[PDB]
Amino acid sequence: KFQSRAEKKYRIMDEKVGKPRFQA
Amino acid sequence: RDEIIKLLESRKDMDVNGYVMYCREELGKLTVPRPRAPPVSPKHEDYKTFVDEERVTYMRMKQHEKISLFLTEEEKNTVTTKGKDILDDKRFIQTIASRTGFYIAEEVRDCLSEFFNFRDSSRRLLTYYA
Amino acid sequence: SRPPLYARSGKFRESEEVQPYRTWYWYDAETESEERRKELRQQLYRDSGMSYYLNIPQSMKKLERVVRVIRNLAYDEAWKQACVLPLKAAGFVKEGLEHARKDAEEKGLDPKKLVVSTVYTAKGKYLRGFQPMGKGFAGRKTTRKTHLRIVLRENASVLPFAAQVVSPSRVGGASQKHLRDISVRYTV
Amino acid sequence: EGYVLHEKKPVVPRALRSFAFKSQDEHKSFVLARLGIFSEEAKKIHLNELRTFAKRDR
Ligand SMILES: [Mg+2]
């Protein structure tokens, strides 16, 4: 509940990358 | 204001042949760029993030013309009429690429997509100015 | 509109035509390497429906709870079983089954004759962590991930299992239990 | 009836495969490291790999 403002961008990118998906 | 509105009114209903002429006019007004080197050495972290935007704009407008010249008249009318439904027709796109014998289906679809994007952009602007 | 076939298959009879290989290259070495791997995969699983689901946030043992129920069953039976199981993993297996069938139709197979012929899991990349314990000791705190692969084939050997089906509760104007005549039960 | 008719390829045990293909794996690494991927030797290797994958579908 106390995440840093200077790393907001990197948390967003990790959330998008680490999602399940089908290969090709 | 009014001259802009008239141009946009014509552009929103423009067909593929009109798009080819459009591309030719934009190229006619363009100074052809030389490729640019990245600002940093190969070991630098930004080496691979460099994009030669000027070269790409030129190359892509040239590609649009070349693909639209393989596209037949029946196909052009089908494109103008279907919009999104032409872009999602893989058999249509594959046929064009196979006829060409060089460009691939992805390139063909993007060229057709930009034609439609042009018309859609003109409609949004038309509302703004009108 | 299938991807090109660049070599003869291993089947007894040939069903497609081999096409000449491309003569152009991709601009970067990284792109060229990635596309070569994609070309290799396109030579496989022709005339069958396949799906490959990556990075499912579950473990191998949790996925095997559901998968062991659907092996060698007809597609219709397998799909129904995955729906009734109240497990978090059952949601991912259901998506894989639908994705594979859509793949089979694009290849020109009949969905009514499909059978689940192969299913297995594969390890993904793990997120490592640590958790403190008593008296200054420490332990592991790991989050696991797995890949799922499903293959559907036509007229493959199948099990005879079949499930009985009943209608749900009737609610609305379609329910007519209130019209029952209870005067008959007073007679002999 | 002759060698050609009765010739057969033996099946390598799973545990011995890292020794049967050691030379071929080294060569592919040797070519890509020195000549690059935009090379005539690299193209030949890729064409042979396409044949192997295509035969998996039986
Ligand atoms: Mg302490």
DSSP secondary structure of B99-130: HHTSS-HHHHHHHHHHHHHHHHHHHHHHHHH-
Q: Resolution, in Å, please?
A: 3.1
> Helices in chain B by DSSP H: which ranges?
2-11, 16-28, 53-68, 73-82, 84-87, 90-100, 105-129
Closest CA to B73 of B22, B14, B15, B12: B15
D42 secondary structure, DSSP code: H
Query: What string of DSSP letters covers A1-24?
Result: ----GGGHHHHHHHHHHTS-EE--
Between the CA atoms of B40, B45, B49 and B54, what dihedral angle is there, to the nearest 10 degrees?
Answer: -10
Q: Which of C41, C57, C99 lies nearest to residue A22, judging by beta carbons?
A: C99
| Cβ pairs bridging A and C (under 8 Å) | 20
Inspect the interface and report whether the beta carbons of B102 and C1 lie closer than 8 Å: no
Alpha-carbon gap, residue C100 to C102, rounded angstroms = 5
- Kindly state whether D40 is in contact with chain C, defined as any CB-CB distance less than 8 angstroms: no
Q: Which amino acid is at D19?
A: F
SS3 of D35, please?
coil
- Kindly state whether D55 is in contact with chain C, defined as any CB-CB distance less than 8 angstroms: yes
For B91, the closest chain C residue by CA position comes to: C1
C97 secondary structure, DSSP code: H
Burial of residue B18 (CB within 10 Å: 0-12, 13-18, 19+) is middle
Structure-token pair, residue B94: 């594959």
Structure method? cryo-EM
Inspect the interface and report whether the beta carbons of D54 and C8 lie closer than 8 Å: yes
Burial of residue C6 (CB within 10 Å: 0-12, 13-18, 19+) is buried
Alpha-carbon gap, residue B11 to B18, rounded angstroms = 9
Q: Which amino acid is at C176?
A: Q
Q: At what angle do helices C88-107 and C60-70 cross, to 10 degrees?
A: 50
- Three-state SS for C34-92 is HHHHHHHHCCCCCCCEEEEEEEECCCHHHHHHHHHHHCCCEHHHHHHHHHHCCCHHHHH
Inspect the interface and report whether the beta carbons of D54 and C36 lie closer than 8 Å: no
Tell me the β-bridge partners of C148.
Answer: C53, C121
The enclosing H or E element of C152 equals strand C146-154
Structure-token pair, residue B101: 């014998």
Structure-token pair, residue D49: 């790999």
Among A14, A15, A17, A23, which would you mutate to test the C interface (most chain C Cβ atoms within 10 Å of its Cβ)?
A: A23
Closest CA to C76 of C149, C147, C165, C148: C165
Alpha-carbon gap, residue C183 to D5, rounded angstroms = 88
Give backbone dihedrals phi and psi of C122, rounded to 5 degrees, phi first: -150, 145
Give backbone dihedrals phi and psi of B20, rounded to 5 degrees, phi first: -65, -45
Structure-token pair, residue D36: 């690059």
Q: At what angle do helices B2-11 and B105-129 cross, to 10 degrees?
A: 150
Alpha-carbon gap, residue D58 to D33, rounded angstroms = 34
Inspect the interface and report whether the beta carbons of D37 and C8 lie closer than 8 Å: no
Alpha-carbon gap, residue B36 to B1, rounded angstroms = 38
